[PDB]
């Protein structure tokens, strides 16, 4: 499923990501934009053998168990296929654990490169919410 910008903004806002651990809603919408282009089915296979899943491109090496990654820890305690659903609930709950660490949203590389430091409230612009 491919989300609209405002449509995803409402869903993320509903799941309590606005200002969660100090990161405003505009950050989360912008992160999902460059990470997966608002596409819940996006998966990018890494060279090391791990895979990134879903709208937030969560890596299987630490966070989820896809069954094909050697030495994985499954910190979110979920199967990686749950991050590919059209309901972002599993992605949001896993993401809340990730951002709680000392690295914050720097765990998402595309967010660090493109969204971090810019005017992120542009993404929630024109959205009812």
Swiss-Prot record:
One of its GO terms (molecular function) is lysozyme activity. GO terms for cellular component: cytoplasm; endoplasmic reticulum; extracellular space. Lysozymes have primarily a bacteriolytic function; those in tissues and body fluids are associated with the monocyte-macrophage system and enhance the activity of immunoagents. Has bacteriolytic activity against M.luteus. Lysozyme C is capable of both hydrolysis and transglycosylation; it also shows a slight esterase activity. It acts rapidly on both peptide-substituted and unsubstituted peptidoglycan, and slowly on chitin oligosaccharides. Monomer. It catalyses: Hydrolysis of (1->4)-beta-linkages between N-acetylmuramic acid and N-acetyl-D-glucosamine residues in a peptidoglycan and between N-acetyl-D-glucosamine residues in chitodextrins. It comes from Gallus gallus. This is Lysozyme C. The gene is LYZ. It holds the Pfam family Lys. The active site is at 35, 52. Belongs to the glycosyl hydrolase 22 family. Its EC number is 3.2.1.17. In the egg white and polymorphonuclear leukocytes. Transmembrane segments: none annotated. It comes from the Eukaryota.
């Amino acid at each position: 499923k491919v989300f609209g910008r405002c449509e995803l903004a409402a869903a993320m806002k509903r799941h309590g990501l606005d200002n969660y651990r100090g990161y405003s809603l505009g950050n989360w919408v912008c992160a999902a934009k460059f990470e997966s282009n608002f596409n819940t089915q996006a998966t990018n296979r890494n060279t090391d053998g791990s895979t990134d899943y879903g709208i937030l491109q969560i890596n299987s090496r630490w966070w989820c168990n896809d069954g094909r990654t050697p030495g994985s820890r499954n910190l979110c305690n979920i199967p990686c296929s749950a991050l590919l659903s059209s309901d972002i609930t599993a992605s949001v709950n896993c993401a809340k654990k990730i951002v709680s660490d000392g690295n914050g949203m720097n765990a998402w590389v595309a967010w660090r490169n493109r969204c971090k430091g810019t005017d992120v409230q542009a993404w929630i612009r024109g959205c009812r919410l």
